[PDB]
Amino acid sequence: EASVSIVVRLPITRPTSKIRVKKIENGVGIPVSTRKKSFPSDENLRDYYIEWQISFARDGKYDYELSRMVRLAHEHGILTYNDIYELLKFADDVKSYLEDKGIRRESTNEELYGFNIYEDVYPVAKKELPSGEFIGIVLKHAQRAVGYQSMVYVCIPLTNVEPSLAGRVARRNEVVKYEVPVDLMKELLKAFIIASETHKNDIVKFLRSII
Amino acid sequence: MEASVSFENGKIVVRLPITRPTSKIRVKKIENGVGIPVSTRKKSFPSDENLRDYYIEWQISFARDGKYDYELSRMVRLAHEHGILTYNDIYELLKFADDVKSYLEDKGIRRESTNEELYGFNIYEDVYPVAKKELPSGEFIGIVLKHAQRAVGYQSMVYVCIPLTNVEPSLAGRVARRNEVVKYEVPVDLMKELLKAFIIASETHKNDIVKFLRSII
Amino acid sequence: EASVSIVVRLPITRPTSKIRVKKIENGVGIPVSTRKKSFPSDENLRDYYIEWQISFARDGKYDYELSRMVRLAHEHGILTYNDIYELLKFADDVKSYLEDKGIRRESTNEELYGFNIYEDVYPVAKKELPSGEFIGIVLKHAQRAVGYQSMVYVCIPLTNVEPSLAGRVARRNEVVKYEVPVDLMKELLKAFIIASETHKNDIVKFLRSII
Amino acid sequence: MEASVSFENGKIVVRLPITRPTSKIRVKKIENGVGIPVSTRKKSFPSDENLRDYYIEWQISFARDGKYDYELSRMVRLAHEHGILTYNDIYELLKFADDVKSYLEDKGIRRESTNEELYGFNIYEDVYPVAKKELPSGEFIGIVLKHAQRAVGYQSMVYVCIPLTNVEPSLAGRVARRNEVVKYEVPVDLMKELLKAFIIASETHKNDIVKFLRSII
DNA sequence: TCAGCAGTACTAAGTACTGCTGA
DNA sequence: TCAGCAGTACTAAGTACTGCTGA
């Protein structure tokens, strides 16, 4: 698990967790064995990033990861009253969500040696922030039943993270400190707001709880 | 977990578990055109019509350890050993493999840009290729492409969807038993279409099929 | 580590430790993957055993594994006064040790395609106890400098150990309970006594400390 | 850790670390006929006579991943590529491998019973076979047999012991430097005797040598 | 300094997450 | 029951034990 201080502490040596270090190779993120291969010391270090599938709530109660960040920052004045207003007014005007895009199987007129060829289109929402972080919203078929489930990711470059790991392997159970910018937390909220009405309704009544 | 492969009464038979919903073999139910997972141990199968929408989806593999002693190759070997798959069957399967020049892997995976935005968030569409074929006996065979997670490139995977009416015993109107597996007699034509599926999935898959088929002949 | 209760608690899922489960195969003990292969339910379970390279002292002070067993059993009257006397009188009469046998390289008159062929002989002391346990004393070249180091092993059959693991895989961090017979503890002491004068001198003054 | 293998001035050169006493490459000192480990970073090498008793013992391997791009095969390949190991050298090495009919592995490992007891404890003698050869250039090559720990059977391992006088720089009268590695020019005759050592160690080792030598020729 | 790596080779743990099994 | 396995696929941890490295 990641501990939240505002600041968070993310482990580097758990590629099977929701927090995993990846490296851009041939355009796709691939898992990195941070303990058998030394991190590059040059410009390639920008191609490395931590992928954190961030969650909003736990136990149906609002104090885990993102929800803990946001309210810690209101209690510290980091988020003004009007931050939460315009976050909610933004939610009040949001009609469509990535869930509304859904997952479709489009039929092509192609036949591969007797096999009919189709295409599955998956909708993805992506936003880049000036400091280098990326926010990803992906759609997946609900494993429990009919419908969709939306999931939010935060991609943090290893250059935005200290101690700098250039020219060495990771430490055992290494946990590294990342200062959380203010507008990442609010763009993360907006990410949940535009993911699904289910996510927005929970973000909406969480912001109302402290405003 | 692995499914039992056996020969009985001149038929290749596989025993498919129906109580491991998290495995390569899982019982599903089509609801509005999407296969939904089924908790076969708490909700009872319907005894009425629309039991057809229930099926077994089997993510079948051909190779293991660079060897051909696993699932499909186990079935094909037994079928060859028992005269179920004849010399002419395998010879012409190899001729079909020689003629195949394009593969499902050639379609690739692309991320399309869109004219759409969602409240300041850029919208992309990742399209994935799938190959589907319906057999007259009721089964479906699907080939989906995906990114090779550890390397770069693609890996293709073959699925066979078996309707519950094609397996025994009849599960109509009851909950699956503890550790229950169903008896599925594999038609000869399905084994051919499954071998062909691996042939057109990717060149790497085809040369595995060709090497196994030629070693048996 | 193994906890001592007299009774000890030995972990089953650490093949790289001093405590490892082995199975006799082709006459030699081979490591067992107690989590990927199910233990046999039949007579083959007798071929499985726990190999524990037992230590006598730690921190140069006498209260670790064997030394903790022995004095716990004197304090409980499990070892009489004359047990420790005849253990020491046995030590007082012991002249030779397995270390005195040493490791030799004997030369054969054979030549394998221009290569001279020799034989290294390693001395081993072995004793079987009626309940099935084995005690092994092996000699190894001292890794630190000139000389030898002696090491004592206890081989415990899986049939002498509960819960019975027939027909299943081990539990995670599984620790299993073994009741320690009285004469195993004293034959273990005698094992250290006949291993080397260095080991005997420490056993000797340990027994004198509580007698 | 792995030793650097390179070609320079018509000589195959390996760079051997002398500050990793726990590795496959470790500095030893013979005291009364036994190689004792040396702490090369706290006790200084002698500048006087009896520095010969100090040597580097290298547990050298030929294969890795079923491939021949590791240590000895790296050296032999470079030697072949640079005319250091000629066509006639490799051809007659293969003829030596064809004639070899017995191996060090054939001697086996036995536990002998003894007429001795040690105060109620049974005494056994486990004997292990070792093959040794001294080269005129000063190096020794040893083949020791051991039980294959994970399987059953034996695995043989080749050692090459290099006296410190055969490497540069001269370490007489000083403590090894931090992360220091020494330059060792590999004589052609040693590479042959090391290839022959693997040939007579076991049949499995020989067929690895024969396959690599024939692929190079 | 002096905590922690270097080196070695292999299994078992961590990992996410529900049904489901078992005693 | 209800704690913990079943199933899945991969790296990183545990392991013993000293020299030795590094910041």
Author numbering:
A (entry chain B), C (entry chain B): 8 to 12, 18 to 223
B (entry chain A), D (entry chain A): 7 to 223
Can you list sentences taken from the study reporting this PDB entry?
R.PabI from the hyperthermophilic archaeon Pyrococcus abyssi was the first HALFPIPE superfamily enzyme discovered. R.PabI recognizes the sequence 5′-GTAC-3′ of dsDNA at its electropositive HALFPIPE region and flips adenine and guanine bases in the recognition sequence to outside of the DNA helix using its β8-β9 loop. R.PabI hydrolyses the N-glycosidic bond of the flipped adenine using three catalytic residues (Y68, H211 and D214), Y68 is used to stabilize the catalytic water; H211 is used to localize the position of Y68; and D214 is used to stabilize the oxocarbenium ion intermediate and to deprotonate the catalytic water.
Here, we report the crystal structures of the R.PabI(Y68F-K154A) mutant in complex with three types of dsDNA. Although the DNA sequences used for cocrystallization are not identical, the structures of the R.PabI(Y68F-K154A)-dsDNA complexes are nearly identical; the maximal root mean square deviation (RMSD) among the complexes was 0.304 Å for 395 superposed Cα atoms in the asymmetric unit (between the dsDNA(GTAC-3 bp-GTAC) complex and the dsDNA(GTAC-5 bp-GTAC) complex). Because the side chain of T28 is inserted into the minor groove of dsDNA, the side chain hydroxyl group of T28 forms direct hydrogen bonds with the base and sugar groups of Thy−5 and Gua3′ in the dsDNA(GTAC-5 bp-GTAC) complex and with base groups of Gua-5 and Gua2′ in the dsDNA(GTAC-3 bp-GTAC) complex (DNA bases of the symmetrically related molecules are indicated by a prime). In the R.PabI(Y68F-K154A)–dsDNA(GTAC-5 bp-GTAC) complex and R.PabI(Y68F-K154A)–dsDNA(GTAC-3 bp-GTAC) complex structures, R.PabI dimers form 31 and 32 hydrogen bonds with the bound dsDNA structures, respectively. In fact, the roll angle at the base-stacking distorted region is larger in the dsDNA(GTAC-3 bp-GTAC) complex in which the TpA step (Thy-4 to Ade-3) exists at the distorted region.
